[model samples]
Target: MGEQPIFSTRAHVFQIDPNTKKNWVPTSKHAVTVSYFYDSTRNVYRIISLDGSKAIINSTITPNMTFTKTSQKFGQWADSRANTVYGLGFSSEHHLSKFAEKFQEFKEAAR
Candidate 1:
């Protein structure tokens, strides 16, 4: 690997499930389990360190799957190790737009 990953950014965002919404009360202590997408084309996701460069093309659900990034534990972990972890891909509108523009450029260039 050229350098260690600075952050982890999810390819997709979760939509709250209505089934769980009724009784769900938001809390820093309560955790949430939801799905997130992973794009294989994204170098960030595919290039999982040079020492071990391999593609993950196993599951059909591999395109996207539910993952738990808890408001309780995972978020707490991210908070505790605040500076070390760096998130990327498309977590924000600005970043997402940038990602789209780049993708568009690639498509056009490929033609």
Candidate 2:
């Protein structure tokens, strides 16, 4: 929580179910603020989002990570560290685009 967020956007966090983890399941009851953070000491970038006091997404960005847009207002990425897929449901395509932009930007920086 020390590092400041380089970017932030609102979205409903979701995860893939464990039946081979194919189906998407909602992780939060409502839309949450998904944020990009830079860990200067660790020299890395991370994506974090919370639902109330619980963390729904805490993925450390990597060059190999892919932010995929499955819909006009939906984006997802597989986090190997967390061993799960995190999905973001944006209110609009613009918000989804902005999040993807930052994902690529920080992903490159993480290289």
Candidate 3:
């Protein structure tokens, strides 16, 4: 017998982001961004992102969040002239609660 898909590697999926264009490469710079998602069926968590194509630098995945309830705990990472992220999460339980905490720092940073 073969292993079920649920127990195997899962590919990331996405819907169109109406606000921006896909494959938006910057003119002369690069950055990394981490993002989160909610998958109700799997009840697991995911973390993904993009790295520099030009320069070599170390960018670590942000600490995730453990959300008890649905709230604005997650958002895209921001940098000057760049915004990047990858789907991260499994089920709406907000298993990645730490991500939310890391995200909250942005609010303070803006001040």
Candidate 4:
């Protein structure tokens, strides 16, 4: 499949702690490129990220996956298929807002 990033932002990537499931587990030492991707072969949207070429996230968007703004500078969502929650920590509220907007926009397109 041909996948290309359509919209991208820099944010610290995190996943929920698998053990306690309450704390956030930082996936990278710093901010990484968090992006909304368009997979042409499948006509689907994905949120993907990598740090040091190591895949930190590989989530396909579904109608039910709601992006949540937990704070002024962070956005999060749970991917059931991936069995985890993804959090993007931004420097400003605007960047997090942009990501949330695209997520909703693509979620509509996916449906």
Candidate 5:
């Protein structure tokens, strides 16, 4: 929490249902700020989001991780370490693309 996010956007956060891999569980009841942060000290990138007092997202950016769009306004990625898939419902396709772009840029930089 020492550094500011490099990019920030609003989205509805979700996680794949633990019991059923197909369904998504809403992490944030409504739209929240999804952000990308660059931790210079550790030379790592992270995707973080908070829902009230709980930490809903704490994903580390890996070069092999992929962000896939399932629909016009929905995009998701699997975080192996977290043992789940995270979904984001954006207000527009443009925001989804922008987030994906930053993800790729940082993924490359991480390598």
Candidate 6:
């Protein structure tokens, strides 16, 4: 099959406040499509999304990557290589859990 995200979901994207490091800054005006893409050409997995023409998130999922739930509807992960934190505010906890589960599956397979 052609390359595409194995899993996809909708969420409002966020970036950690660079100045405060404790707050989140919304990256999109509203919810956008977040997806887990397997790059067959490079043989790697990534979490990617776009807001208009700008790439909101393009994080590669390493074996050490961890998806953390900071709140009931929020989940985040720190991308050391990218030197940034990516967060997703899902419409429901179920969506967050589904994303996290897929993350773990990919993380394990990447190992």
Best by TM-score: 2
For each candidate in the order shown, give its overall lDDT on alpha carbons. Answer: 0.27, 0.90, 0.32, 0.89, 0.89, 0.88
lDDT tens digits by residue: candidate 2, 12-44: 999998668789999998999999889887889
What is candidate 1's local distance difference test score?
0.27
State each model's C-alpha RMSD to the native: 13.4, 1.4, 13.5, 1.3, 1.6, 1.4
Task: Put down candidate 6 lDDT per residue, 32-94, tens digits, no spaces.
Answer: 999999888777898989998788898888899999998888999998866878889999999
Error of 5 at 100 (Å): 1.1
TM-scores for every candidate against the unseen true structure: 0.26, 0.95, 0.27, 0.94, 0.92, 0.92
- Judged by lDDT relative to the true structure, which candidate is superior, 2 or 5? 2
Which candidate order results from sorting by lDDT in descending order? 2, 4, 5, 6, 3, 1
Report the C-alpha lDDT of model 4 over 1-111, residue by residue, as the tens digit: 598769988999999998888999998899998888999988889888899889889899987789999999997898887798888899999998888889999999888
- Give the Å error, residue 11, model 5: 0.3
lDDT value, residue 43 of candidate 4: 88
Q: What is the lDDT of residue 33 in candidate 1?
A: 17
Give the worst 10-residue stretch by lDDT in candidate 4: 1-10
Q: lDDT value for candidate 2?
A: 0.90
Clashing pairs in 4: none
How much is 33 displaced in model 4, in angstroms? 0.7
**19 Cα displacement, candidate 5 (Å):** 3.1
Q: Model 5 segments beyond 4 Å from truth?
A: 1-4
Error in Å for residue 93 of model 1: 0.5
The stretch of ten residues in a row with the least summed lDDT in candidate 3 is 1-10
Give the clash total for candidate 1.
2
Q: Evaluated with lDDT, which candidate comes out highest? A: 2
Backbone N/Cα/C clashes per model: 2, 0, 10, 0, 0, 0
lDDT for predicted candidate 5 compared with the true structure: 0.89
Model 4, residue 68: C-alpha shift (Å): 0.2
Model 3 bad stretches (over 4 Å):
1-48, 51-87, 90-95
